[PDB]
Design a protein around this ligand. Structure first.
Ligand SMILES: NC(=O)c1ccc[n+]([C@@H]2O[C@H](COP(=O)([O-])OP(=O)(O)OC[C@H]3O[C@@H](n4cnc5c(N)ncnc54)[C@H](OP(=O)(O)O)[C@@H]3O)[C@@H](O)[C@H]2O)c1
Ligand SMILES: NC(=O)c1ccc[n+]([C@@H]2O[C@H](COP(=O)([O-])OP(=O)(O)OC[C@H]3O[C@@H](n4cnc5c(N)ncnc54)[C@H](OP(=O)(O)O)[C@@H]3O)[C@@H](O)[C@H]2O)c1
Ligand SMILES: NC(=O)c1ccc[n+]([C@@H]2O[C@H](COP(=O)([O-])OP(=O)(O)OC[C@H]3O[C@@H](n4cnc5c(N)ncnc54)[C@H](OP(=O)(O)O)[C@@H]3O)[C@@H](O)[C@H]2O)c1
Ligand SMILES: NC(=O)c1ccc[n+]([C@@H]2O[C@H](COP(=O)([O-])OP(=O)(O)OC[C@H]3O[C@@H](n4cnc5c(N)ncnc54)[C@H](OP(=O)(O)O)[C@@H]3O)[C@@H](O)[C@H]2O)c1
Ligand SMILES: Cc1ccc(-c2c[nH]c3nc(N)nc(N)c23)cc1
Ligand SMILES: Cc1ccc(-c2c[nH]c3nc(N)nc(N)c23)cc1
Ligand SMILES: Cc1ccc(-c2c[nH]c3nc(N)nc(N)c23)cc1
Ligand SMILES: Cc1ccc(-c2c[nH]c3nc(N)nc(N)c23)cc1
Lengths: 250, 251, 250, 249
């Protein structure tokens, strides 16, 4: 039997790269999406052309709310329904935008989105993944710049720190069940679609190794290592994939 | 004129000790509390008997909800209402209980409480504190020295304390241009839980390299007083461990 | 043209397992050793039987002294002399013994040995590696327990801390030359030969992931990853390979 | 009776400020120096003028060598000879200069100087301090240790080893009641020769006030750690950096 993976936010960019690589490695994949239905299905179409019935899609909002646990549980269930098993969870989906401390979503909607997508949904999915249970692991997409954060990104930063705490707490607690829990921390990978090109080059120029961003594939490579048999003793570890960026003083 | 401080969860234990020491240092204090009304009033009474009109209490639930921001705004506004200023914010109030990943409150209530008290309310109180300014302004967040060696089955609590580390850093960076410093104090083992039995308390005490005992509430409060003082005017974004070496001890 | 790697302290245990996996991956190897002459030459024989002329030994004391730079330069030179190139350096050789602060070598010898092997030698080998110069990289064998250190191991812990600093500084400074510098940090792996059984078992019981020590091969797997094409954007990272041990409170 | 402190590299700048504040707090002080004899002596004369018989000087090279353990024992012993006790050790003296990985001092002299001053000497002074016993040690660290100066490998290795010492010694000496902590400046007093335009570059990076820490601000954090108000604090390194270490590239 082929193992199975859930990748959240898998329609585009890094999540897509991660789904594609797991599938190339032999996984069957659940492609979760929120708004990008068309892109999710076109990826599944591409993956299912390669190997029939090895990719499904799954829709969910991962904003925190009264129904988030049920949604998270259904994401995990959808993998069991499609493939009869769930070997790997990749927590990739993530809201990202500024939340200034001093001055139209309300602040509490921003808390729900930023803290839900980056921390609470990962926790709930982690609970469901472990409950519903080999080489089992979870990989959380973290952020190499958590200790030198973007200015005015308090909530996003809080959510990523919380995700580090989850990675550690879950590694500790799930080790007796054979479930490893690790992270991959990009620095500058694919820049935001909205960022202007000048500003993109400014960030690229900061990176010591090659003065460029990481491709989505290079991030996906670290995920693939972490879920592999070459990482069977690794839990609680967060691998930076940042080209030295986090080492560069102001 | 005397400066003023808000201390969250200040009715008892470490919060009380911080309020008392701020008061002994010359601050007027807002003693925030949630359920411990009697202890909070008893504190304010003692402080006002020492110096009249220098302590008031302020009730608020710091669970996350759509009204938590107005509740946090009101906490800061109660300092200005009582004392005409707000110089210091200490984020001490904290929910703390296990949330096992594999198996009472709904999980969304646990999230609301553990993440709300430990991170969201500090963030909203920071926003409000900063917004109301309009000097030695600072914020001290009560953190946790065992954050990278966490208590088994305390996921949400640990997430909340990690998030608070991130707020401390993010706010230190962002509020520095306003002259608001933001720091943290990280206890290891201090006052053990009221409900813990003596035998269990001793097991923890025996782990502590420095004196095989927990930190007094006062010793925690001392590090808070340092960070608010003029002796710490260049310190921002620092979290001081107050743990007798506990976090250095391997399994 | 097959790449070439120097592995220090490669006669035995983790260093051995690293040299073996590097060789299996296609590398030619310099098997550095200090006192383990017989195991070193025996390992070279093993590997050379598999592919002729793909392993040589190189003897050197890595204690700090006025001649250590020359010795380090020679180790690198020995890789060029055997194979015409040097693509990978693995800093594995390491002295390890207690140096109590309060009361049969002298303290300056203990300093030279512990700080030399764990920090100075890696620094000088890094200099000579870079000076002599693609997928070039350096992997430093660190320690996951560096912030929860063994009692009365000050000098050793100082050495491994210094080694983290080197990893970071070297990643930063060598990134313009295309040389990546990373680390692998074991917790409990192969236990001391001189340690007694009951004590070995006490340490095993502490490891959340499986209640056992890492094999030398599990440690080598992480080295192999960091030198590979799948780690091309990775520099300045230290991967814990510790089964969750560093997450466990006292 | 008055407690006593050894401050290494105390003739100038941050070490001087530390020695003065310790003295203002009631400590008798050993002012260690290497080359700056004239400044160490004028400091001693200043402090003895304030209160008689409360400052002495001690010359020593803290470069690593065969004789460094004896030199470090002598510094401690000199505190006992002058004052009958040694309550506080402040490891401040520090060599600092670039050591590029790719290219008069040989590289082994740089190793001896950079690693000796920043790490080995603190280690030897710590053993001597402890062997002779509110006792504490404060080590001067560096807030920028994880975002290091380009081409300062050996220096950075030295300061990292110092963090390790701080932690290892905190753990091991806790049973004797000796606390061991650090103060980590980011940008404090800039090099004497540095052009203002270069100094200002650094000052502008500092979120809190867009200026460097005074030596006195660094000293304040030392005074807190040695005090009765830090009685439970061991193995802690306090950044005194105006938020510099939180600033991304
Ligand atoms: N890009 C970088 O340079 C970088 C740097 C540091 C860290 N990271 C981390 O690496 C991961 C991938 O980054 P990325 O740049 O590829 O991410 P991204 O494009 O910002 O977002 C990934 C996906 O997250 C999903 N998402 C957003 N809000 C959601 C919600 N409320 N509910 C459910 N799904 C939601 C979206 O799915 P739909 O499109 O289907 O709505 C989106 O496509 C993230 O965790 C990120 O924080 C990335
Ligand atoms: N004690 C330790 O050894 C230790 C260890 C590590 C970290 N710390 C940190 O140091 C701080 C103080 O510790 P502690 O042991 O003194 O704390 P605590 O006794 O557990 O709780 C402090 C106060 O938190 C308030 N609180 C709890 N839930 C709340 C809610 N939903 N809304 C508003 N307030 C709420 C309570 O106020 P009421 O009583 O009025 O309801 C309580 O009195 C905490 O942040 C803690 O995490 C302590
Ligand atoms: N084993 C673990 O659990 C563990 C835990 C954490 C970190 N690590 C790190 O992983 C690496 C490998 O660990 P290990 O247990 O396999 O190492 P080890 O057996 O203790 O030492 C490996 C080799 O280092 C060489 N060595 C010692 N002193 C030397 C000197 N003065 N000059 C040159 N070489 C010298 C020895 O070579 P000869 O035998 O040829 O004399 C020895 O065989 C080390 O860096 C270690 O610190 C290991
Ligand atoms: N200035 C900063 O911004 C900054 C930033 C980060 C960390 N720090 C740390 O804070 C501490 C004080 O900094 P600073 O700028 O005031 O230091 P500094 O002026 O660079 O050096 C202080 C003293 O160290 C002594 N020293 C140098 N080499 C020595 C040797 N071989 N043996 C004995 N003593 C030696 C010198 O004593 P003599 O003059 O008597 O020869 C010198 O005056 C240092 O530990 C430093 O690394 C400072
Ligand atoms: C220059 C730049 C811009 C964004 C990001 C990024 C970090 N975390 C992120 N998380 C998400 N969900 N999207 C992102 N685009 C980022 C990193 C560097
Ligand atoms: C042995 C022991 C027991 C509890 C605590 C504790 C950590 N964080 C905490 N946070 C709160 N709000 N209360 C607590 N009691 C703790 C630490 C060590
Ligand atoms: C129970 C135990 C005993 C030793 C080691 C070990 C740490 N670092 C080490 N470094 C070297 N060069 N050899 C080792 N054997 C170790 C780890 C756990
Ligand atoms: C712009 C600048 C220049 C030097 C220093 C400094 C760091 N560590 C140091 N250590 C010593 N012994 N001296 C120093 N002068 C420094 C910090 C910022």
């Amino acid at each position: 039997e082929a193992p199975a993976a859930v990748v959240t936010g898998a329609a585009k960019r890094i999540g897509r790269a991660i789904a594609v690589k797991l599938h190339q490695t032999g996984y069957r994949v659940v492609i979760h999406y929120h708004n990008s239905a068309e892109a999710a299905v076109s990826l599944a179409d591409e993956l299912n052309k390669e190997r029939s019935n090895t990719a499904v899609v799954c829709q969910a909002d991962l904003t925190n709310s009264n129904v988030l646990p049920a949604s998270c549980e259904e994401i995990i269930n959808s993998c069991f329904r499609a493939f009869g098993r769930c070997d790997v969870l990749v927590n990739n989906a993530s809201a990202f935008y500024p939340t200034p401390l001093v001055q139209g979503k309300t602040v509490e909607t921003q808390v729900a989105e930023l803290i839900g997508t980056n921390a609470i949904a990962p926790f709930l999915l982690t609970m469901s993944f472990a409950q519903r249970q080999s080489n089992l692991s979870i990989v959380n997409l973290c952020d190499a710049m958590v200790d030198q954060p973007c200015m005015a990104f308090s909530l996003y930063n809080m959510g990523k720190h919380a995700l580090v705490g989850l990675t550690q707490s879950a590694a500790l607690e799930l080790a007796p069940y054979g479930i490893r829990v690790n992270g991959v921390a990009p620095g500058v990978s694919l820049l935001p679609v909205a960022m202007g090109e000048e500003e993109k080059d400014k960030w690229r120029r900061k990176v010591p190794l090659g003065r460029r961003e990481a491709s989505a594939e290079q991030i996906a490579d670290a995920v693939i290592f972490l879920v592999s048999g070459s990482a069977q003793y690794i839990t609680g570890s967060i691998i930076k994939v940042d080209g030295g960026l986090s080492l560069v003083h102001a």
